[PDB]
Amino acid sequence: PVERILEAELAVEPKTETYVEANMGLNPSSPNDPVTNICQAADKQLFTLVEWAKRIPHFSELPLDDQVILLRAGWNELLIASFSHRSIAVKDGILLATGLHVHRNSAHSAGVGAIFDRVLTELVSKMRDMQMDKTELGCLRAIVLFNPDSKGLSNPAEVEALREKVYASLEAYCKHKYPEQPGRFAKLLLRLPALRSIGLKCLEHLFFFKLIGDTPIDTFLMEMLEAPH
Amino acid sequence: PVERILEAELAVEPKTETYVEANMGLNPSSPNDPVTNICQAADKQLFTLVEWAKRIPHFSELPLDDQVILLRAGWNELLIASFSHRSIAVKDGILLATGLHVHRNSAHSAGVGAIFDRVLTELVSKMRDMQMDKTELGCLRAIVLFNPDSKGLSNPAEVEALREKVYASLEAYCKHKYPEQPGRFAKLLLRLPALRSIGLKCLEHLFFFKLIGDTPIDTFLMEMLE
Amino acid sequence: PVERILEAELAVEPKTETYVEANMGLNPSSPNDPVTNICQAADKQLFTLVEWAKRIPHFSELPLDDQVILLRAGWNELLIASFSHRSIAVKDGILLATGLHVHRNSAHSAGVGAIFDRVLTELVSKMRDMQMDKTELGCLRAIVLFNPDSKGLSNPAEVEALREKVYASLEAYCKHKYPEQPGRFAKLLLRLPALRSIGLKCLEHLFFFKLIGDTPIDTFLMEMLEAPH
Amino acid sequence: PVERILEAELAVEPKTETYVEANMGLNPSSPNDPVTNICQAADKQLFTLVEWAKRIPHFSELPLDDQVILLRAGWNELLIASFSHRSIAVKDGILLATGLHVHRNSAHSAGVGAIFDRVLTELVSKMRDMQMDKTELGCLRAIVLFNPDSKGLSNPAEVEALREKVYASLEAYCKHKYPEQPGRFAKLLLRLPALRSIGLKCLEHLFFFKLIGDTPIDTFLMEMLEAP
Numbered sequence A, C: 001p002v003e004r005i006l007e008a009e010l011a012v013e014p015k016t017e018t019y020v021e022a023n024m025g026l027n028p029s030s031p032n033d034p035v036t037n038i039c040q041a042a043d044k045q046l047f048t049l050v051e052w053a054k055r056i057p058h059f060s061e062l063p064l065d066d067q068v069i070l071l072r073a074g075w076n077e078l079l080i081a082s083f084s085h086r087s088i089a090v091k092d093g094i095l096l097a098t099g100l101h102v103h104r105n106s107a108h109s110a111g112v113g114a115i116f117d118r119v120l121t122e123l124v125s126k127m128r129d130m131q132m133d134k135t136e137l138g139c140l141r142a143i144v145l146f147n148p149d150s151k152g153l154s155n156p157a158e159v160e161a162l163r164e165k166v167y168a169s170l171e172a173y174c175k176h177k178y179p180e181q182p183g184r185f186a187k188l189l190l191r192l193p194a195l196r197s198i199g200l201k202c203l204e205h206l207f208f209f210k211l212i213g214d215t216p217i218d219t220f221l222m223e224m225l226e227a228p229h
Numbered sequence B: 001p002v003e004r005i006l007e008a009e010l011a012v013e014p015k016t017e018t019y020v021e022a023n024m025g026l027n028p029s030s031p032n033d034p035v036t037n038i039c040q041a042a043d044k045q046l047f048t049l050v051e052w053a054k055r056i057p058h059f060s061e062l063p064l065d066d067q068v069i070l071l072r073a074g075w076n077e078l079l080i081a082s083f084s085h086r087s088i089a090v091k092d093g094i095l096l097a098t099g100l101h102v103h104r105n106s107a108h109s110a111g112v113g114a115i116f117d118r119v120l121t122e123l124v125s126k127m128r129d130m131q132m133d134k135t136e137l138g139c140l141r142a143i144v145l146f147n148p149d150s151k152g153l154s155n156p157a158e159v160e161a162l163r164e165k166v167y168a169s170l171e172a173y174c175k176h177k178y179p180e181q182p183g184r185f186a187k188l189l190l191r192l193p194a195l196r197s198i199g200l201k202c203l204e205h206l207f208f209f210k211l212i213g214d215t216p217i218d219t220f221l222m223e224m225l226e
Numbered sequence D: 001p002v003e004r005i006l007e008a009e010l011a012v013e014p015k016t017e018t019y020v021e022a023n024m025g026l027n028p029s030s031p032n033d034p035v036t037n038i039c040q041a042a043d044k045q046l047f048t049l050v051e052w053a054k055r056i057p058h059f060s061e062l063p064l065d066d067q068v069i070l071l072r073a074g075w076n077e078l079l080i081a082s083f084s085h086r087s088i089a090v091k092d093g094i095l096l097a098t099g100l101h102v103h104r105n106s107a108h109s110a111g112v113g114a115i116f117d118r119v120l121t122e123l124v125s126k127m128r129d130m131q132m133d134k135t136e137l138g139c140l141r142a143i144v145l146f147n148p149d150s151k152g153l154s155n156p157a158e159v160e161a162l163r164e165k166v167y168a169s170l171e172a173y174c175k176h177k178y179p180e181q182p183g184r185f186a187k188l189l190l191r192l193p194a195l196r197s198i199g200l201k202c203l204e205h206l207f208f209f210k211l212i213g214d215t216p217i218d219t220f221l222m223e224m225l226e227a228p
Ligand SMILES: CC1=C(/C=C/C(C)=C/C=C/C(C)=C/C(=O)O)C(C)(C)CCC1
Pocket: B038, B039, B042, B045, B046, B079, B080, B082, B083, B095, B096, B097, B098, B208, B209, B211, B212
């Protein structure tokens, strides 16, 4: 069921109450301790990522250790793929939670303007222009999850076979929804290299962290220093 | 025409008169200076990459400054794709163009065995098991050359168009040559993510430089220190 | 001087009971939730570093903005120096503040084996070979803390003067305590280059996150994966 | 003996002509070719480095394998240390062997400005303010050369022993040459961590390669496919 993929994708997508609420500030968590925020949002993100994977057919039938291995190897790219696709809605930017979100400047003043340019140019814009739908996105993420190159896999050949079945379905799906675009399938697959190197840069540069800034760092450190000697 | 790409592949390949010349040696030059000998080796492989690119249909039709951009953006992966495939003939190392064979334990030379094993497992090992031919290898490198994401391109849309004509022909080729492998075309394309990340790791470990420079440098060092 | 710095090393770090809790039960909180758990663990460790810094003579008399700068510049080296010295007792892996022994094989399984081995050979064994004592360790860390090369300092010269006071006192201590080892003082300082490069490699490898986050994450993963759909 | 080392640094102490030929252009090599230019050097630098090391007492006495491993473990820091001291005579710039001056502007333009500025503020400026002399520089370099943490050497102990002889000598030097400044020995030694991190960053960020500029890349690259 190429739907059980799209379904898993749609069953994890952020609502419109976290887009709204956070946009104006109608959410709780009172922005006062931004040491919690990143942590809480991180745990929620991780939780939802695991739920999404368990819904991917055959994933849970994989060995325990291998499931952990695949998640540790793809979580980064799986997250980048999602927010890039959600960013199709914003004008020249990335979407996280609060009223549209981070623009180039914020990224620029954060020192990561160059990788921000890469995300918009290689992912967001490309997804928007060929109008990647949520079913194709779900399939690409599943292909990412079923990464046969992951180190430690008890049986990489099994992971590769599940990957084959996933993209075999994506090809049929494309062949049915866009007969006019015979090269759509390949085009989809040809976004994975960009996802790979962008994923590596965001990792090595801690993209998202630097976006937040270093003032909260100085703030919490200051709080420790004003701790009662 | 996937055959015009297949031809560009063979032409730029050694004539076994160079292969012998190293995996069997034959340097009618005798190594002497190190850093200079290394650059000459680099200049050599670099020029052969440019020769190859010129023989790729339409490449030379793109604006000159864009050709340079695509070259500076893909040289790294293009060379890795070349020796990873050529290394299918051997059992446990990477076979360089200059015929030189660099084993694993000997290559790792307590310095780059990590990415070295990645080349064997993610690229070399996979290419051998599926037995991709020079035509498929050629099309994959052509796809890599025609990278529409290359920063600074004046017309990404035209590079993308050229890229599409290539994998469309690659797909037709695969479905005609290997009738009973419907997922072969996709499997070929799915090695690009690996090539992309290995490409990056080879840059931060000067994999190349060391691969073609530690011997000339160690030789130099031994005479100097004698 | 030497005595106040030694007192700083001894104060925050031990109680035969602390090294207890995390290495045979007799511990609370039970690992369950991911990110927030590790963030609290990190917060605690960093605080111990701040309390220590505040006990080093003159550090507190510097502008608050400079204390923050020095802490941001040296925290990673200050911590590695601490656990590296604590590990001279064993010949396998490293001992954490909680006295728990992280074995060599755990570092290699986590993909940080090469850097872990550097800590072992360049710091742990070297400290063991010369039997570096706690006074000398504290002085080296104080020197690392007063790093005049830190960017943004309002007055690097004052930080440099605080550094020289520390190493002038360290040298007197060594020559008085170990008169038969004339090159001891230099040998102590010559471990700083190693601490520097190891410090940088630990950052690029996310050494610290893996040290406190790898286990709680896999536990969370393995539990949710086999749990009821 | 380090004036045999200071004589080792003087046996190559960038003469005079070499500086006027480059700090003007009265040098052959017709600055027409690039690859050839940057290459004649680094080969010349490597040669001068190896000859410098052979003159360091006891080095040539180590097993051959240990010698090459020490040289390849330290060449980067050895080179950075040398042009840093030589640049004391210049402001916000660096001087290479031939009198080739590289200003920080070129570094910030190529994307390696922060590392270039670390060389200026952590090495050059420090060396200048304390007036580090060539003998002290030669000893710091000998210490870096005898790096006992170097991987794969047959006897780390023997290397650290040679390292101790060097710094014991450096301390003696400082005490008698500068009796009025007791912290000088330590100060010299405390420039080593900075040299360590700078060397690593220079390698990580392809320092030298980026200083060449991108134009000479597009140059002969445009040449290769613009043949005649
Ligand atoms: C542009 C370039 C370099 C290129 C090296 C190459 C291209 C090496 C080896 C290729 C092999 C071994 C290819 C194959 O056999 O297919 C080096 C690092 C010297 C540094 C200067 C920039």
